[PDB]
Amino acid sequence: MEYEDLELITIWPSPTKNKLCQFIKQNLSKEHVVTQLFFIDATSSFPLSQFQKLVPPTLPENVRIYENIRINTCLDLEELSAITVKLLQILSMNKINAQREPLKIILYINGLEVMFRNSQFKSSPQRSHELLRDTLLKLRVMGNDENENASIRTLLEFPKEQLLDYYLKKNRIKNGDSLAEYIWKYYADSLFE
Amino acid sequence: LKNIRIYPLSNFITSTKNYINLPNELRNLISEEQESKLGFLHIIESDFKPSVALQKLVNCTTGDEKILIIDIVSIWSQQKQRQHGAIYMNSLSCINITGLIVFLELLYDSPMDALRRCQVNFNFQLRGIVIDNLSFLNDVINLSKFEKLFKILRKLREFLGCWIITKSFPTDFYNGIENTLVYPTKLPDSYMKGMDLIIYREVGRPQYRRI
Numbered sequence: 001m002e003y004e005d006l007e008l009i010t011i012w013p014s015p016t017k018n019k020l021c022q023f024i025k026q027n028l029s030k031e032h033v034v035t036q037l038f039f040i041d042a043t044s045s046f047p048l049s050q051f052q053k054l055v056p057p058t059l060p061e062n063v064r065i066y067e068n069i070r071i072n073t074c075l076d077l078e079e080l081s082a083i084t085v086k087l088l089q090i091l092s093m094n095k096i097n098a099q100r101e102p103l104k105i106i107l108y109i110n111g112l113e114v115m116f117r118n119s120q121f122k123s124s125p126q127r128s129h130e131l132l133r134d135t136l137l138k139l140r141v142m143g144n145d146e147n148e149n150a151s152i153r154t155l156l157e158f159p160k161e162q163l164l165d166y167y168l169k170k171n172r173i174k175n176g177d178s179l180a181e182y183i184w185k186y187y188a189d190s191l192f193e
Numbered sequence: 194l195k196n197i198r199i200y201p202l203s204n205f206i207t208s209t210k211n212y213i214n215l216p217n218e219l220r221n222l223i224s225e226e227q228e229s230k231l232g233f234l235h236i237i238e239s240d241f242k243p244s245v246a247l248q249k250l251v252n253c254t255t256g257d258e259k260i261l262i263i264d265i266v267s268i269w270s271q272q273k274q275r276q277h278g279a280i281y282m283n284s285l286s287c288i289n290i291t292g293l294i295v296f297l298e299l300l301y302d303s304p305m306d307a308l309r310r311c312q313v314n315f316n317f318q319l320r321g322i323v324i325d326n327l328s329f330l331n332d333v334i335n336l337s338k339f340e341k342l343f344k345i346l347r348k349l350r351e352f353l354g355c356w357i358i359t360k361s362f363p364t365d366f367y368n369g370i371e372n373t374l375v376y377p378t379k380l381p382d383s384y385m386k387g388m389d390l391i392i393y394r395e396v397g398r399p400q401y402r403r404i
Contacts, residue, residue, distance in 0.1 A: 008267060116370065125373040133329060137288045140267035144283055176372035186241055186366060189268075 003027050003035060003104050006153035007189035008143035009136065011180065014160040017047040021054045027106060028065045035104040036068045040083060042111030042118075044073045077119035077131040080109070084135050088142060091150045098149035105150070107139070110157040113179040132179075136187045156183065166191060210354040211320045213390075216249035222403040223390060231389050232350055234358045237378040237404075238394035239365070242268055243325065246394070246401055250323075250358055254278030257317040261308075261355070263287065263296075263324045280311045280319075290330040290338050297345045301352060321356045322349065327380060328362040340383040347387065363393075376404055 001023055015023075028035045039046050055062050074080050087107065094103045120128040139154050158180035164172060165181045177185065184191060213231040215222070223231075238244050243251075251260055251269075254277075263282045264270040270281035286292045300307035305315060330338075346357045367379040376385055377393055385391060391404040 008271070120373065125369060129369050129374060134289075137265070137267070137329060138285060141283060141285050141288060144267040144271060146272070176368055176375075177370055179370050182370045185239070186362065188241075 001027075001192065003030070003106065003153065006106075006155070008140050009154045009156065009183075009188045011156050011158060011163070011184055011188050011191040013158055013163050013166075013191065013193060015157060017050040018054065020047065021051050024051070024069070025055050025065065027104075028068050029061075030104075033102050033104050034068065035106065036070065037106045037108060038070045038072065038083075038087065040072045040074045040080065040107065040109045042073070042075055042114040045110065046071055074109075074111075074115060075118055076115050076122065077128060077135065080112075080115055081131060081135050084138060087152065088138070091142065091145075091152060094150040095147050102148060103150040105152040107152055107154045108157070109154070112156055112183075113158065113162060116179050136183070140187075156180075156188065163191070210350065211356050213250065213321070213356045213358065214253060216246055218246040218249065218401055219392065222392070222401075227389075232356050233346070233387060233389045234356070234392065235380075235385065235388045235390075236358070236360045236392045236394065237363055237376070238360065239363055239396060240394070241266070243360070244394055244399065246392075247358075247360065251321075252276045252278060254320060258320045259317045260321045260323060261300075261311070261319060263293065263322065265293075265324070265329050266326050269323075269325065280308065280313055282311050284310070288329070290342065293324075293330065294338070294341055294345060297342075297349065301345060301349050304353065319353055319355050321358060322346070324357075324359045326360050326362065327384075328366055328378070331367070331379065336381045336383045339381045343384045343387045363395075 024037055028037060055065055057063070057066055072083060074083060087105065091103070091105070116128055116132060119131060139152070143152050143154060145151070160167065162178040162180035163184060164174075165177070166184060210232060212229065213234050215228055215231065220228075234250070236244075236247055236250075238247070251262065254260060259278055259280050261280050261282065262269045265288050267283055268274065269279065270283040275281070282296060284292075287296050296307060296310070299310075304319070308315065330342075349355060350357060361378045361380055363377050364379055368375045376391060393402050393404050394400070395402070
């Protein structure tokens, strides 16, 4: 999966550790652009062990890759909203400074269903849904910006078991959509297996 | 004698307003006379992306005609999706109802200034405004905000002559994740009462039905 082919928001169900690593390697290795990975996780589970095996930090061509991966542990929607603010600042300033090389940001979020759950228990269902909505719609507008100096694309990881609506549509009792299904139906452009 | 009214026929076949042309997929829903006077259409559908019928309703221009698409969902204005007869508003200043109302009030007051925010030469006729998706704008506060929204859209139709098409999701969207939030859509009558035609799309066969 090349950056240029990514949709504004893409769901990636249960990626293997090797596939995640290769995706990161291929994209951050692109010449003539600065590609960065912001990995935002509720469980602090970036596969560091596999990544170091496939992309050894001891090899010269790999130094910049490690320098352009940013890691964050994010426990709730309020923290994710703050991270989105920071990303928009980075993008906005890059665009401005670009006339005062091109920046390509991949925002990769794992465990969004647990951030949502956490927020929901600290606030309300209504507030969590409004914060989720506000953050996703903002990331779409950000990714949709025609500007060529700086771009963002968002990838959302979910376990396949939270996307049964998708797999069974191929071709079970259920009490409403999982967060993954909700996003699949209402916020994401596509889902990549 | 003083009160006698004699009208030229050309009055009855001429209008200062644009009307919506229903595609074949939506014909047979309303009268003949009713389709002739469609100014406000609301569509309820589960699709995040626009259904084929909605696509046909838009991208219906010819020559200098343009449709203003207020793209709250960032779909229509995506580079691979843009069409020649559309003008797009896709801005962080217009993804909530307060910002939306501010923009539409400017469009009414000073179309040129509003349209400049959509990066538009002004050699064209504005035929229609589309808003996608109203469900993302969701106590008695929303009844008032939506009434204000409808009132400004109606003023815009009166002044500019554009038709108005809006979309929302069905009630199932309003149930929320795992039903934690628990017409077949959740918009106030304050808005729905103003529609000339309300259409509901229920899907493996998609069926368009009038409400």
